[PDB]
Amino acid sequence: GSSGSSGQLRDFSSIIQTCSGNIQRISQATAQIKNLMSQLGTKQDSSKLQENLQQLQHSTNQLAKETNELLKELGSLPLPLSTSEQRQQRLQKERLMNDFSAALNNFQAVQRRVSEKEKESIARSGPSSG
Structure with a gap:
């Protein structure tokens, strides 16, 4: 694996490793949402969870935003x-x-x-106005 400290640059190996990680997280947070999902499915609910979900969602969201960005900077590198x-x-x-x-x-x-x-939650059925 990584062994040293001097260069410090967006090297293919430096990006890759990062890309790999991102993926994990993405898959991780995605797991938390599912894991946290059931949790909610217990008659009652908790904002502490609902919030966790989003946080886990957004986080992953960006994480991906970067991945795609990196995946772009990766191939960008020379040969x-x-x-x-x-x-x-x-x-x-x-x-x-x-x-x-x-x-x-x-x-x-x-x-x-x-x-x-x-x-x-929102549902929204049967309109009523006037």
Whole structure:
């Protein structure tokens, strides 16, 4: 893994590692929402949770915003003289993109469920005016 301290730059390895992490979190927070979800599903509810969800949501949101940004800055980086490192590079990113997705989708499928909970709350049926 990482061993040293001097360079300090958005290196492919520096970005990757970061990208990887982000993914985890995204998948993590997404898990908290699901884990916290049931919690709410206990007859009663708690704002302490509802808030946690959002916080976990937003957080992940941005996290992703960065990931995509990095994934962009990654490929942006130049290529080595050796073609061996060239493939290993894109190859890595290739997975990252996918991995990130698998995590993204998760959040999505979660976003829906959440929205649903908020859908029932508001509901809004049978208009009445006048």
